[PDB]
Amino acid sequence: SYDIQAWKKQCEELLNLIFQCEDSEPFRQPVDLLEYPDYRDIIDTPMDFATVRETLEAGNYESPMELCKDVRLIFSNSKAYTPSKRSRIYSMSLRLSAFFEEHISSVLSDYKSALRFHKRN
Ligand SMILES: O=C(Nc1ccccc1)N1CCN(C(=O)c2ccco2)CC1
């Protein structure tokens, strides 16, 4: 399976599944700075799934590793902002992270395999 471009639609489909997950609700749009006026004191680089989808659709990711770095930032920002590891939003983040990591592993493996095949000779 040596298609160098296949990751893009695989990531589109995975984002569609994440948007259907009730657990993505806190993370579908940029964090509410009116509700959380201290947010930017703690979070240097806000990230959300709508920003990830728009970056993908703009053609502004070169690899699935770059998309994976932005998705992981959503999960670290939620951890950086939680007052407790027993919070509803952080708890949703941990389940969604597990789901994402389970699904992204084959996308990354296939892509890196395809690049190695392209450079084989
Ligand atoms: O406002 C948010 N997101 C939103 C929701 C609806 C509309 C616009 C934006 N948030 C709150 C801050 N976040 C946290 O990860 C967190 C952990 C503990 C408390 O919040 C991210 C989601």
Side-chain angles (χ1 to χ4, degrees), residues 25-33 35-36 39 47-48 74-84 87-91 93:
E25 186 285 348
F27 312 108
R28 291 165 190 168
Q29 309 279 316
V31 163
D32 196 325
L33 303 181
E35 291 172 16
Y36 303 93
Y39 190 72
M47 191 54 59
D48 65 280
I74 299 169
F75 303 140
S76 47
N77 288 343
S78 186
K79 186 172 191 170
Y81 194 66
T82 196
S84 146
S87 302
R88 178 77 199 284
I89 294 185
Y90 176 64
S91 80
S93 87

Side-chain angles (χ1 to χ4, degrees), residues 21-28 88 91-93 95-96:
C21 290
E22 291 182 355
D23 288 336
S24 74
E25 186 285 348
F27 312 108
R28 291 165 190 168
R88 178 77 199 284
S91 80
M92 292 163 84
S93 87
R95 292 187 297 260
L96 196 64

Side-chain angles (χ1 to χ4, degrees), residues 16-19 21-105:
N16 285 341
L17 288 175
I18 287 169
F19 273 91
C21 290
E22 291 182 355
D23 288 336
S24 74
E25 186 285 348
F27 312 108
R28 291 165 190 168
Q29 309 279 316
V31 163
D32 196 325
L33 303 181
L34 304 185
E35 291 172 16
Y36 303 93
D38 65 338
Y39 190 72
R40 288 305 309 279
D41 305 343
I42 305 125
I43 303 305
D44 287 339
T45 309
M47 191 54 59
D48 65 280
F49 286 108
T51 299
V52 175
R53 183 179 263 168
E54 284 161 17
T55 302
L56 185 66
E57 293 311 275
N60 289 178
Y61 288 128
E62 186 179 12
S63 69
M65 297 84 78
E66 289 178 350
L67 178 145
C68 187
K69 182 170 152 176
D70 284 351
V71 169
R72 287 162 185 167
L73 188 63
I74 299 169
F75 303 140
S76 47
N77 288 343
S78 186
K79 186 172 191 170
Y81 194 66
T82 196
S84 146
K85 303 202 169 161
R86 309 181 55 198
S87 302
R88 178 77 199 284
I89 294 185
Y90 176 64
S91 80
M92 292 163 84
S93 87
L94 293 181
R95 292 187 297 260
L96 196 64
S97 174
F99 175 81
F100 175 72
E101 291 295 333
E102 174 180 296
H103 285 71
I104 205 62
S105 59

Side-chain angles (χ1 to χ4, degrees), residues 6 8 55 111 114:
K8 179 174 184 178
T55 302
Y111 174 80

Side-chain angles (χ1 to χ4, degrees), residues 103-119:
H103 285 71
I104 205 62
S105 59
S106 59
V107 177
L108 295 167
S109 293
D110 288 358
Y111 174 80
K112 294 178 173 190
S113 168
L115 233 45
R116 291 189 292 267
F117 188 80
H118 190 72
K119 305 158 209 290

